[PDB]
Amino acid sequence: THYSRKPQVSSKSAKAKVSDLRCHYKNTFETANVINGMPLRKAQQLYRQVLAKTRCIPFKRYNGKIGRTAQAKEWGQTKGRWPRKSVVAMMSLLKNAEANAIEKGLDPNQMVIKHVQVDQAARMRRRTYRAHGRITPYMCSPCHVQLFMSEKKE
RNA sequence: UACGUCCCUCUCCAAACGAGAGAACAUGCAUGGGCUGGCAUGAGCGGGGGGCUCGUCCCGAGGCGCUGAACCUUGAGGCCUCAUGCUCAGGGACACA
């Protein structure tokens, strides 16, 4: 009940989805929106390069006083980061989507990532202890990621 | 399509981070040598108040000699190509509906 969009040709498109990821929403937002037009192998290349800290993830919406870096001129930004926990959870999802392409009978080297959508999951409640006897919230904010990818060849 | 630009890499006249100046098989980097400076004579070995032993031989801080020795010298980043090592079709992304 979850996919906002459906593929054109569903017999040439493999889906993948995360139930409740427990990464930060505001970092898996930009980790995942950067691969929304990329092929599967160029999107996987980007994530192995964010881990090596050779390329960065551009923070374009939930940036808000992050440090500005020299590597965000690739994306036309000034500030971006290397969110390694949102990166490696998106690598588990690209590996699920290409396993779901092989059992459909499809070549995973021809898959363009159509449709990345990240939405907010239900938050999880903890507690921090402030001065003067106060107790105030310490929420988690996890996320929902979904993607298909449609084959574009010849 | 090309010229190219940017990232990663290297340098520091720049620098909170970006940006900047540069270099990109280049004495470029690494180590060594010499210079230049700093300290103040290294470990080791051998020949003095006194005091043991049976003229001799041992204990003794200090001293003297080899010894302006030894060590340190660019590194947030002194000098000299003075010698040699290391690189082996640099890699990614745009430029490009």
Contact A75, A61 (CB under 8 A): no
Instruction: Name the region of A105 (left: φ>0; alpha: ψ -120 to 50; beta: rest).
Output: left
In 3-state terms, what secondary structure has residue A49? helix
Q: Which residues touch strand B (CB under 7 A)?
A: A 42, 45, 49, 54-55, 67-71, 73-74, 78
Q: Solved how?
A: cryo-EM
Burial class (CB in 10 A: 0-12, 13-18, 19+), A79: middle
Instruction: Give me the resolution in angstroms, 1 decimal.
Output: 2.5
C-alpha distance across the termini of chain A, in Å: 33
- The span from the CA of A3 to the CA of A141, in Å, is 21
Contact A95, A14 (CB under 8 A): no
List beta partners, residue A57: A81
Strand B nucleotides below 7 A of a protein CB?
6-8, 16-19, 91-94
- The span from the CA of A70 to the CA of A110, in Å, is 32
- The span from the CA of A37 to the CA of A149, in Å, is 10
φ/ψ (deg, to 5) at A125: -100, 125
CA quadruple A144, A41, A62, A23: dihedral positive or negative?
positive
Q: How many residues does chain A have?
A: 154
The integer distance in angstroms from the CA atom of A111 to the C1' atom of B51 is 99
